Design a protein around this motif. Structure first.
Motif, PDB file in Angstrom:
ATOM      1  N   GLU A 188       0.938  -1.191  -0.123  1.00 12.98           N
ATOM      2  CA  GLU A 188       0.071   0.102   0.208  1.00 12.98           C
ATOM      3  C   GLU A 188       0.924   1.022  -0.009  1.00 12.98           C
ATOM      4  O   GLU A 188       0.788   2.325  -0.721  1.00 12.98           O
ATOM      5  N   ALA A 189       1.880   1.313   0.789  1.00 10.29           N
ATOM      6  CA  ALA A 189       2.785   2.362   0.635  1.00 10.29           C
ATOM      7  C   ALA A 189       3.454   2.585  -0.424  1.00 10.29           C
ATOM      8  O   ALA A 189       3.778   3.584  -1.093  1.00 10.29           O
ATOM      9  N   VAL A 190       4.045   1.490  -1.176  1.00 13.59           N
ATOM     10  CA  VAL A 190       4.592   1.686  -2.550  1.00 13.59           C
ATOM     11  C   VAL A 190       3.636   2.123  -3.443  1.00 13.59           C
ATOM     12  O   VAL A 190       3.855   3.234  -4.171  1.00 13.59           O
ATOM     13  N   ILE A 191       2.301   1.953  -3.659  1.00 12.96           N
ATOM     14  CA  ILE A 191       1.742   2.142  -4.646  1.00 12.96           C
ATOM     15  C   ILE A 191       1.290   3.686  -4.346  1.00 12.96           C
ATOM     16  O   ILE A 191       1.015   4.575  -5.236  1.00 12.96           O
ATOM     17  N   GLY A 192       1.170   3.975  -2.882  1.00 15.03           N
ATOM     18  CA  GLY A 192       0.693   5.278  -2.659  1.00 15.03           C
ATOM     19  C   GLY A 192       2.044   6.309  -2.873  1.00 15.03           C
ATOM     20  O   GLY A 192       1.962   7.443  -3.520  1.00 15.03           O
ATOM     21  N   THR A 193       3.003   5.680  -2.742  1.00 13.21           N
ATOM     22  CA  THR A 193       4.200   6.588  -3.171  1.00 13.21           C
ATOM     23  C   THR A 193       4.311   6.888  -4.661  1.00 13.21           C
ATOM     24  O   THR A 193       4.917   8.095  -5.002  1.00 13.21           O
ATOM     25  N   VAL A 194       4.297   5.866  -5.337  1.00 10.96           N
ATOM     26  CA  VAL A 194       4.327   6.012  -6.627  1.00 10.96           C
ATOM     27  C   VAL A 194       3.383   6.722  -7.414  1.00 10.96           C
ATOM     28  O   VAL A 194       3.874   7.646  -8.306  1.00 10.96           O
ATOM     29  N   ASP A 195       2.058   6.941  -6.957  1.00 11.01           N
ATOM     30  CA  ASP A 195       1.262   7.860  -7.320  1.00 11.01           C
ATOM     31  C   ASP A 195       1.657   9.063  -7.325  1.00 11.01           C
ATOM     32  O   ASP A 195       1.685  10.165  -7.823  1.00 11.01           O
ATOM     33  N   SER A 196       2.389   9.408  -5.837  1.00 10.68           N
ATOM     34  CA  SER A 196       2.844  10.678  -5.436  1.00 10.68           C
ATOM     35  C   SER A 196       3.906  11.144  -6.550  1.00 10.68           C
ATOM     36  O   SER A 196       4.005  12.411  -7.091  1.00 10.68           O
ATOM     37  N   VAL A 197       4.848  10.103  -6.511  1.00  7.59           N
ATOM     38  CA  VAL A 197       5.830  10.495  -7.655  1.00  7.59           C
ATOM     39  C   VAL A 197       5.351  10.984  -9.094  1.00  7.59           C
ATOM     40  O   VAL A 197       5.905  11.961  -9.648  1.00  7.59           O
ATOM     41  N   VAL A 198       4.500  10.184  -9.654  1.00  7.59           N
ATOM     42  CA  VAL A 198       3.833  10.682 -11.033  1.00  7.59           C
ATOM     43  C   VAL A 198       3.066  12.037 -10.994  1.00  7.59           C
ATOM     44  O   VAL A 198       3.241  12.648 -11.849  1.00  7.59           O
ATOM     45  N   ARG A 199       2.702  12.287  -9.769  1.00 11.64           N
ATOM     46  CA  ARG A 199       2.012  13.552  -9.289  1.00 11.64           C
ATOM     47  C   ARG A 199       3.019  14.593  -9.403  1.00 11.64           C
ATOM     48  O   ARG A 199       2.783  15.685 -10.177  1.00 11.64           O
ATOM     49  N   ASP A 200       4.112  14.423  -8.561  1.00 10.39           N
ATOM     50  CA  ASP A 200       4.967  15.613  -8.528  1.00 10.39           C
ATOM     51  C   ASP A 200       5.930  15.670  -9.693  1.00 10.39           C
ATOM     52  O   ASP A 200       6.566  16.645 -10.048  1.00 10.39           O
ATOM     53  N   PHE A 201       6.326  14.763 -10.688  1.00 10.06           N
ATOM     54  CA  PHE A 201       7.217  14.619 -11.620  1.00 10.06           C
ATOM     55  C   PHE A 201       6.438  14.563 -13.030  1.00 10.06           C
ATOM     56  O   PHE A 201       7.006  14.965 -14.079  1.00 10.06           O
ATOM     57  N   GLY A 202       5.471  13.909 -13.003  1.00  8.23           N
ATOM     58  CA  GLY A 202       4.617  13.717 -14.242  1.00  8.23           C
ATOM     59  C   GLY A 202       4.862  12.498 -14.811  1.00  8.23           C
ATOM     60  O   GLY A 202       3.818  11.980 -15.646  1.00  8.23           O
ATOM     61  N   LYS A 203       5.849  11.847 -14.780  1.00  9.77           N
ATOM     62  CA  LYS A 203       6.388  10.543 -15.195  1.00  9.77           C
ATOM     63  C   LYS A 203       7.384   9.683 -14.632  1.00  9.77           C
ATOM     64  O   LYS A 203       7.881  10.448 -13.434  1.00  9.77           O
ATOM     65  N   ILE A 204       7.408   8.433 -14.886  1.00 13.59           N
ATOM     66  CA  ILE A 204       8.767   7.879 -14.129  1.00 13.59           C
ATOM     67  C   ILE A 204       9.263   7.125 -15.663  1.00 13.59           C
ATOM     68  O   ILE A 204       8.812   6.250 -15.932  1.00 13.59           O
ATOM     69  N   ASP A 205      10.562   7.774 -16.028  1.00 14.04           N
ATOM     70  CA  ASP A 205      11.249   7.079 -17.483  1.00 14.04           C
ATOM     71  C   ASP A 205      12.062   6.019 -16.555  1.00 14.04           C
ATOM     72  O   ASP A 205      12.199   4.928 -17.616  1.00 14.04           O
ATOM     73  N   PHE A 206      12.760   6.315 -15.680  1.00 11.72           N
ATOM     74  CA  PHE A 206      13.719   5.289 -15.159  1.00 11.72           C
ATOM     75  C   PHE A 206      13.501   4.770 -13.842  1.00 11.72           C
ATOM     76  O   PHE A 206      13.088   5.566 -12.848  1.00 11.72           O
ATOM     77  N   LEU A 207      13.852   3.501 -13.786  1.00 11.87           N
ATOM     78  CA  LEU A 207      13.697   2.842 -12.296  1.00 11.87           C
ATOM     79  C   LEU A 207      15.070   2.194 -11.718  1.00 11.87           C
ATOM     80  O   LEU A 207      15.462   1.283 -12.508  1.00 11.87           O
ATOM     81  N   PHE A 208      15.688   2.487 -10.714  1.00 11.52           N
ATOM     82  CA  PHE A 208      16.795   1.827 -10.073  1.00 11.52           C
ATOM     83  C   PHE A 208      16.219   1.257  -8.893  1.00 11.52           C
ATOM     84  O   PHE A 208      16.129   1.948  -8.097  1.00 11.52           O
ATOM     85  N   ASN A 209      15.842   0.007  -9.019  1.00  7.65           N
ATOM     86  CA  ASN A 209      15.214  -0.902  -8.129  1.00  7.65           C
ATOM     87  C   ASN A 209      16.168  -1.426  -7.165  1.00  7.65           C
ATOM     88  O   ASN A 209      16.630  -2.658  -7.388  1.00  7.65           O
ATOM     89  N   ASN A 210      16.734  -0.841  -6.122  1.00  6.74           N
ATOM     90  CA  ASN A 210      17.780  -1.078  -5.275  1.00  6.74           C
ATOM     91  C   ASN A 210      17.901  -1.064  -3.841  1.00  6.74           C
ATOM     92  O   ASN A 210      18.841  -1.751  -3.405  1.00  6.74           O
ATOM     93  N   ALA A 211      16.678  -0.717  -3.271  1.00  6.61           N
ATOM     94  CA  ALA A 211      16.740  -1.115  -1.759  1.00  6.61           C
ATOM     95  C   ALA A 211      16.913  -2.450  -1.563  1.00  6.61           C
ATOM     96  O   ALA A 211      16.366  -3.346  -2.225  1.00  6.61           O
TER      97      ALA A 211
END
Ligand SMILES: NC(=O)c1ccc[n+]([C@@H]2O[C@H](COP(=O)([O-])OP(=O)(O)OC[C@H]3O[C@@H](n4cnc5c(N)ncnc54)[C@H](O)[C@@H]3O)[C@@H](O)[C@H]2O)c1
Ligand SMILES: NC(=O)c1ccc[n+]([C@@H]2O[C@H](COP(=O)([O-])OP(=O)(O)OC[C@H]3O[C@@H](n4cnc5c(N)ncnc54)[C@H](O)[C@@H]3O)[C@@H](O)[C@H]2O)c1
Ligand SMILES: NC(=O)c1ccc[n+]([C@@H]2O[C@H](COP(=O)([O-])OP(=O)(O)OC[C@H]3O[C@@H](n4cnc5c(N)ncnc54)[C@H](O)[C@@H]3O)[C@@H](O)[C@H]2O)c1
Ligand SMILES: NC(=O)c1ccc[n+]([C@@H]2O[C@H](COP(=O)([O-])OP(=O)(O)OC[C@H]3O[C@@H](n4cnc5c(N)ncnc54)[C@H](O)[C@@H]3O)[C@@H](O)[C@H]2O)c1
Ligand SMILES: [Mg+2]
Ligand SMILES: [Mg+2]
Ligand SMILES: [Mg+2]
Lengths: 260, 260, 260, 260
Positions: free
Chosen positions: D67-90
């Motif tokens: 739930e936190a992941v989806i909520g955060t991703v939605d926020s990222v798309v709101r704040d930047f408009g798109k997500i071209d790249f992902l570094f899945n590193n944690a």
């Protein structure tokens, strides 16, 4: 624009991948020594590289002749002063036939050009890099070396040999600030040599592909997750990456360039 | 006794692994055709095999000569009537030197005996197995072909070639009820082949091993999770498994026999 | 007929590969401890094993519960005295959906049963084997772990984890005369599992398979060089080989059982 | 400067590799969305990124909570408009212990953070990327996933899962112009995460390393052909290569960054 003041010996420079890679390295400011056994193709390539405005010279040399390779590498060291990078790319595709009918003289020829010849070049150039205590090398292997394909007994074995040679060379040369890696292109097209592979697999009639060349091209492309063969121009950037500083802690690795 | 009724052609049969495997397959009931270029070795090996109670015969043959290989295979068929199993095992260890100083003539020699010779045998024999719609083949690769070792440029490339060739052959021959697999022995000992390796690696003075042979054998055994080299006799069973029906749905695979 | 006096704990024993393998080990004289969460499957499996004439007992146990696994292994040790072999096989196939819509709860469930659950069993059992300074273990992986398939995100990740866990465990347990290996079956049929795979892959509608189950089955079979799915009865002999002495110098390896 | 106008989401952005990678991407002109569970490390990390003169924002988020992941991703798309790249590193390194003594709770925690959490992120972000019909993803695996290391049962298994998951996701997402690749760092130092590995391996007292931390460090460096651990800054350029157009025909590949 990196690579300024760098010198690269490109073998098979008159061919598709060799010319395309030379141009990219040149566009980056790299000086190019072109080596190919095919004079006409060689000079046509030298011309295209010269325009890029970098220093460039050609050398007609058959890599299966070690004496010709050693003389040529020495002429290169003399003409450019040093060899920073090597794209050990010359190669022959081989006939296409199931193993039980594979032409024996052709089998030895594939090994001699693709393995022994690549080795003649790697040895002579590596000695020079050792005196420079610097060098980056990219050997052109192939997805056929990663997994032996049907009807390509010789080629597959030559490229699998290249992958092991790359790992051994990486270990031997590591102490002298030299890195050695490989690229393994999958289905690349179009133009020609893509048409050769399509026509010649079709001609075999094995259970792996149709005897109809139009149908074979669809089966090959159809096997790629990206559902397209790769463009020759999608290879030079992988080479440049393996020669440059972003791959500083990478050596002995093999990069599939195959669409998935 | 499974294998009762079967016939296996073993190349390099006068050598270590070749003899051990021939004996094990004879204990299981298989008639043995021994092939080696060394007559003295073959004859001692043939007598040991016959002691096991099966039919056994010797053929002096240099696998680098296709004419000799084809001649020999035909004689094997005339004498035994068929060839069910093939242990494609003859091989040459090569020199030990870092790549920049690797003897070029030796490099071509290693490839010719280990890859081209192996291929000459595979081709001639698979033609007979296709006639039978039955065949099981095991090629001797090596951990050296799985990852290229230091100072073994030619040997590692030759076994990397065998691994890909095994994959191509498996594909080519699957339609005729033939399976093709490989084994990849790691450190095996004692004896002078184990000793030659310790000794010649020590001689190079590379960063990978001590210059002291006692320390090199320690370093080698110390790199094995099971902390011991493998006995030559821990190979025959693996070959038998890949030839028999317990591996009926396996082809194109390579089995490490390396201790971890 | 070896394995007389041996004791093998088989997880997933009520299942197809599990029952097939227990029968083959029983045929060699090994006593079987059957472990499964499915009571009905278990009792029918046990009846089949006893028929072979060896000692056998069933244990209802959910491998995801470490406490249930610990208590179960203790009971097997009291009841049989020791545990010589382990076939760590219980598993769940998971949903079929492209990663962007793969059910998240199912993803976690696949990892818990296929990885964490197999680890609980492997840990509990290895403790007993260390106590005996003897043990041979086979983990059931999958070709989906060797190469991630389309629409099987969780299952592929779970089996790729099993292949790594197998290599670590082999290193960890080596000093105690314990060997740990894996098997990686490819396409197996006919039956529920095969029907499910075909049907659910067809339903996804991805570019990798037809939308018609009849065709999807043909495409899967068509991808195999041997051009047939394997029979689960072609798996027990491989497990038996990895457990017995012919694989004595083999640990940390993964054997594909996939047809090419 | 390529990547001008690009937006990359970096998880574990407060850690060594994530910060180092975000800085490099920021130097190429990339806006960074930093994601981590530790707010304080995020704060410092975002401070460092801002200083490169690109738009950057931080997000406190535990990738194990979908739930936190989806909520955060939605926020990222709101704040930047798109997500071209992902570094899945944690990721979490896990305990260090031989498998028979591996703490079972930690085993599960490792899988949940390193596999399930990376999956939560991958799923949510690929959904966005599909919407754009554009995306490049890099998952951080590790050499521990390439070959299972001693005393790291949970971690090696989680990274082997990432490599398979990377292949599946590459297949699943290829039709939407998305590529998915992985990197597999070997020994990277100095610092305290490297010191942690050295100290904890020494603490186990297994046969694989010395019990003296100082010697362990040398043994680890000594197993590297380039004879040095890699610098964390030798990872960013690789991730950038995998996200940029030079790797345009590469998907489903894992690149070792290990020194040989
Ligand atoms: N095109 C593909 O799809 C593909 C896929 C995998 C690997 N490769 C490999 O890439 C390399 C370049 O291939 P291409 O696609 O550029 O083909 P190409 O035929 O256009 O070029 C190969 C070049 O090498 C030269 N060459 C051959 N034998 C030589 C010898 N004895 N001495 C000196 N030069 C010699 C040829 O004259 C030619 O110019 C080869 O090693 C090839 O096997 C190509
Ligand atoms: N001993 C090891 O540790 C080890 C490890 C990995 C792979 N291998 C491979 O296993 C196989 C058997 O090796 P070994 O350990 O038994 O050594 P070996 O020297 O005792 O046997 C090899 C045999 O092949 C024969 N041979 C060589 N060239 C030949 C030719 N042109 N024609 C016909 N016969 C020829 C030799 O006469 C010899 O009897 C080889 O392919 C070898 O490279 C051995
Ligand atoms: N059948 C195939 O095609 C195939 C292909 C590749 C890998 N495999 C693997 O082989 C193994 C066995 O496969 P199968 O063909 O025998 O399947 P199966 O369904 O017939 O049997 C799996 C068995 O494991 C048991 N099981 C599941 N979760 C359990 C749990 N938490 N605790 C205890 N028991 C549990 C089931 O009850 C069942 O009896 C699995 O690990 C599977 O993923 C099968
Ligand atoms: N350092 C190495 O040598 C090395 C080698 C191979 C692989 N890796 C992998 O590279 C990645 C980067 O690690 P590092 O080297 O940067 O270590 P690191 O500790 O500095 O960074 C990992 C970061 O991820 C975060 N994280 C952990 N659990 C999380 C969770 N549930 N939710 C959100 N964030 C979480 C941490 O708080 C931390 O900021 C990891 O996946 C690691 O396992 C590192
Ligand atoms: Mg190989
Ligand atoms: Mg049933
Ligand atoms: Mg893996």
């Amino acid at each position: 624009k990196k690579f300024n003041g760098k010198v690269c010996l490109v073998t098979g420079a008159g061919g598709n991948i060799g010319l395309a890679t030379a141009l990219r390295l040149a566009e980056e400011g790299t000086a190019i020594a072109l080596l190919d056994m095919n004079r006409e193709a060689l000079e046509k390539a030298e011309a295209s590289v010269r325009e890029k405005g970098v220093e460039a010279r050609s050398y007609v040399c058959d890599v299966t002749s070690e004496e010709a390779v050693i003389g040529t590498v020495d002429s290169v060291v003399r003409d450019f002063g040093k060899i920073d990078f090597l794209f050990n790319n010359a190669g022959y595709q081989g006939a296409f036939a199931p193993v039980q009918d594979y032409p024996s003289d052709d089998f030895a020829r594939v090994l001699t050009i693709n393995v022994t010849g690549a080795f003649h070049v790697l040895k002579a150039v590596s000695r020079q890099m050792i005196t420079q205590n610097y060098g980056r090398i990219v050997n052109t292997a192939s997805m056929a070396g990663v997994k032996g394909p049907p009807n390509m007994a010789a080629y597959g074995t030559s490229k699998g040999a290249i992958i092991a040679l790359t790992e051994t060379a990486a270990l031997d040369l590591a102490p002298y600030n030299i890195r050695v890696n490989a690229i393994s292109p999958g289905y690349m097209g179009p133009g020609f040599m893509w048409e050769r592979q399509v026509e010649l697999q079709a001609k075999v009639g094995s259970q792996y592909f149709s005897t109809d060349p139009k149908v074979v091209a669809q089966q090959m492309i159809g096997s790629v997750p990206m559902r397209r063969y790769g463009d020759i121009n999608e290879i030079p950037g992988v080479v440049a990456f393996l020669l440059g500083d972003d791959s500083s802690f990478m050596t002995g690795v093999n990069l599939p360039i195959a669409g998935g």
